Design a protein around this ligand. Structure first.
Ligand SMILES: [Zn+2]
Ligand SMILES: [Zn+2]
Ligand SMILES: [Zn+2]
Ligand SMILES: [Zn+2]
Ligand SMILES: [Zn+2]
Lengths: 50, 145, 195, 49, 64, 117, 99, 108
């Protein structure tokens, strides 16, 4: 029920800078299933499905 | 109802106030112990976090007394004194924190490491660091053939 | 041993007044010394590792910075993966290397010569907490609003975050995730030639 | 293509508003709603956007 | 930890028991069989096994 | 108010517990262990901040400017050394999770100036 | 469910609210300290000395019985008002409980 | 806080205390004139009645009850009760519950 959690040290992943509260950083997928998903959206989507 | 820190050593039948475990390692005066636990004497809050535990065991003030105190817990009740102090010394060297060292005269190392353990605990309680996550894989080791 | 040759100050030789500002140093969890200039020590050591010097490749090396510890691991069981190393804003992997690998079968310029030349680096789950990964060498390109602009590593390719059965799925990123998980589980029941 | 452009424009709008909200909160310009702390109000507003 | 100890003198196991008078900071250990009785101060950390081990040293020390 | 710190004996180095000199009605710091005695200075013995009004600037260490993982911004020039670039970040401590206020630190070598907004 | 006009206006409802909710002293205290004051006429603290000497000169309560040891407690305003509350009632309660 | 206690003090002065509801030294605050008489005659009669009611109302060896019969013993009995310490421990554990709530965004 919450956005993706900060599992690294104030980072959702090591591709983002620290204390990043943007929509991309916490797991907003701005793509359709027909446009693909960029690798970080793929990982966050995996977490939700799990 | 002040917070009182204690340690659970291996092969000692009861919990033990940590300040005792510092006495039994030969750092007898109070200030020498707070040199090893509190790496900076300016933060008052951690000092009054440590005060209660430094009161809890004001009674035991010398290395051999604390070694008695520890070894009285342990193997079998009715045992001579010298065996009791040998027991406590054997524990605090061989069994407690081996990775720091099993050889003798590893007591300044052992005291610094135990002070580190307590420092980390006090930060966790004052909130200056986050509680360790269990499912972080940095903390885990895969155990191959 | 190398640390002793450097300006490490072993622990049984310190006045406890000094620890306040210095940086601690743990080698496999054992508080081994202290040091006064951390960053130079870290750069020295990472350089030594990058040269295949005394520090073997699989030696994780973290630097907690808010708290003042440096931690070095050599134990067994840690998991790690190779990444590309980044200069200021540029990979160290030039086309010299691609040229020499392309004839990997004549020059015997293998992968080992590629780690040996300070181009890839094994970074493990705990040292990742302190890197900044470019997903692809385009993140390096100076953007209109440079996102981070101080990257440390790159991914070799994003698609190597998948496994042996999930690497069969074609276009896995157009699928909903439980679909990919079932296919992973049904690709192990599929009659073929097993040997 | 027209509806693709609509969709992209809506997404750009939404991300811009979320950036605005963030920098408000960075300037101490955001004030909690009744029954909710600052973290929770911040999160609730971003999720609503 | 346990509380009943072999009498150091009559060698009867579990025949010694202790009374910790926390009011006076003094604990007594008494052998029911031989009626031997040992008195000694206690502090708020002390336990029966600590008291007992004062007795043994008192026995040996006087037996020197 | 201000917090109150411990002070140690000069024979034992043990912590000097307080008590009162009733016949003089003045505060003495004494040693439970040795028989050393000292005359006090505070006249206060205990303090609790129920609100927990801790300022994080003390917790900040000027070395955090080295982090590559940590945001860099050009807009806020350093007040002290006049440098252009400075890192910034959240509070990130228990009892301080609210208040997404930012803390700024200069990124010049050996300037180490820190401030807030 | 509120019964009377409290159903309609918010203020009456909030009154009833604060009259249900439990409010121990911690919730309405800023900070406390245990001073050593032998002489009430001369507090260690300065900012309190005014109302101090306003109280201690009139001998409704004995000065001889008083011990030199002190509690001083700080109340913060916005909390203090949220429960629509005043030091009179807290004084009253402390009288009631310990006598 | 406008109205003043204004009760007649023994020194002839009127109280200047700014209490919202009650004077700690004169009970309930009633509105008084410049010379301290309550404006309401009924309130004055009630105050007079209350004042009248208030005005109306082995020996050589030590007695152990002297220690048992003292304020300090009473307070010690009250505070050092198993119920009281249990409530104290419960409240302090709820304090611990808040400092457990000091990890919002991350895993904790
Ligand atoms: Zn016997
Ligand atoms: Zn002393
Ligand atoms: Zn600067
Ligand atoms: Zn009055
Ligand atoms: Zn009055």
């Amino acid at each position: 029920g919450k956005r993706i959690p900060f599992g690294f040290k104030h980072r959702t992943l090591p591709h983002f800078i620290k204390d990043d509260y943007g929509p991309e950083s916490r797991g907003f997928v701005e793509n359709s299933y027909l446009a693909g998903l960029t690798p970080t959206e793929f990982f966050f989507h995996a977490m939700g499905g799990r | 109802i002040g917070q009182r820190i204690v340690a659970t050593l291996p092969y000692i039948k009861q919990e033990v106030p940590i300040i005792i475990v510092f006495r039994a390692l030969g750092f007898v005066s109070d200030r020498d112990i707070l040199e090893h636990i509190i790496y900076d004497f300016e933060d008052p809050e951690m000092m009054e976090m440590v005060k209660p535990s430094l009161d809890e065991a004001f009674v035991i003030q010398e290395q051999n007394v604390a070694l008695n105190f520890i070894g009285s817990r342990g193997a079998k009740p009715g045992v001579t004194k010298e065996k009791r102090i040998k027991y406590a010394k054997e524990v605090l060297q061989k069994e407690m924190l081996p990775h720091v060292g099993v050889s003798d005269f590893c007591e300044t190392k052992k005291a610094y490491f135990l002070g580190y353990m307590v420092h980390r605990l006090l930060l966790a309680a004052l909130g200056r660091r986050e509680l360790d996550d269990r499912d972080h894989y940095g903390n885990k080791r895969l155990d191959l053939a | 041993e190398f640390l002793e040759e450097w300006s490490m100050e072993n622990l049984e030789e310190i006045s406890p007044a000094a620890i306040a500002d210095a940086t601690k140093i743990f080698v496999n969890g054992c508080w081994v010394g202290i040091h006064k200039d951390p960053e130079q020590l870290m750069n020295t050591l990472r350089k030594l590792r990058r040269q295949m010097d005394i520090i073997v490749s699989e030696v994780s090396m973290i630097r907690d910075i808010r708290e003042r510890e440096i931690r070095i691991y050599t134990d067994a069981g840690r998991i790690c993966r190779p990444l590309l190393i980044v200069e200021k804003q540029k990979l160290l992997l030039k086309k010299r290397h691609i040229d020499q690998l392309k004839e990997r079968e004549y020059n015997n310029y293998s992968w080992q010569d590629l780690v040996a030349s300070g181009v890839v680096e094994y970074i493990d789950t705990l040292e990742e907490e302190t890197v900044m990964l470019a997903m692809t060498p385009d993140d390096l390109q100076e953007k209109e609003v440079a996102y981070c602009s101080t990257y440390t590593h790159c991914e070799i390719h994003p698609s190597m975050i998948l496994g042996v059965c999930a690497s069969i799925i074609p276009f896995p990123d157009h699928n909903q995730s439980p679909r990919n998980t079932y296919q992973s589980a049904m690709g192990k029941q599929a009659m073929g030639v097993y040997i | 293509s027209k509806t693709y452009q609509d969709i992209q424009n809506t997404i750009k709008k939404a991300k811009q508003d979320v950036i605005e909200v963030i920098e408000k909160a960075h300037n101490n310009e955001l004030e909690p709603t009744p029954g909710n702390t600052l973290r929770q109000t911040f999160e609730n507003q971003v999720n609503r956007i | 930890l346990e509380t009943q100890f072999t009498c150091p003198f009559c060698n009867h196991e579990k025949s010694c028991d202790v009374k910790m008078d926390r009011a006076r900071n003094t604990g007594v250990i008494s052998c029911t069989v031989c009626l031997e009785e040992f008195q000694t101060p206690i502090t708020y950390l002390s336990e029966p096994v600590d008291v007992y081990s004062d007795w043994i040293d008192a026995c040996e020390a006087a037996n020197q | 108010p201000g917090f109150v710190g411990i002070r140690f004996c000069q024979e034992c180095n043990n912590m000097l517990y307080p008590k009162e000199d009733k016949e003089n009605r003045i505060l003495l710091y004494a040693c439970r262990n040795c028989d050393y005695q000292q005359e006090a200075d505070n006249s206060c013995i205990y303090v609790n901040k129920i609100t927990h009004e801790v300022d994080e600037l003390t917790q900040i260490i000027a070395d955090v400017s080295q982090d590559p993982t940590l945001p860099r911004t050009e807009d806020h020039p350093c007040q002290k050394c006049g440098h252009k670039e400075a890192v910034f970040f959240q509070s990130h401590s228990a009892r301080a999770e609210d208040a997404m206020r930012l803390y700024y630190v200069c990124t010049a070598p050996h300037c180490g100036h820190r401030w807030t907004e | 469910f509120l019964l009377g006009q409290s159903a309609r206006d918010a203020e009456r409802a909030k009154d009833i609210l604060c009259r249900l909710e439990h409010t121990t002293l911690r919730k309405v205290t800023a900070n406390t300290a245990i001073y050593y004051d032998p002489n009430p006429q001369s507090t260690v603290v300065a900012e309190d000395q005014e109302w101090v000497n306003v109280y201690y000169e009139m001998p409704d309560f004995d000065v001889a019985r008083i011990s030199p040891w002190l509690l001083r407690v700080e109340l913060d305003r916005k909390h203090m008002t949220d429960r629509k509350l005043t030091m009179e009632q807290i004084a009253e309660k402390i009288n009631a409980g310990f006598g | 806080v406008q109205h003043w206690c204004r009760a007649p003090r023994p020194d002839g002065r009127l109280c200047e205390r700014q209490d919202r509801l009650k004077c700690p030294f004169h009970g309930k605050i009633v509105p008084r004139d410049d010379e301290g008489r309550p404006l309401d005659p009924e309130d004055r009669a009630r105050e007079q009645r209350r004042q009248l009611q208030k005005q109306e109302r082995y020996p050589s060896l030590t007695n152990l009850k002297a220690q048992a019969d003292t304020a300090r013993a009473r307070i010690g009995r009250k505070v050092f009760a198993k119920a009281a310490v249990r409530r104290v421990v419960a409240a302090m554990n709820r304090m611990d519950q808040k400092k457990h709530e000091k990890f919002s965004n991350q895993f904790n």
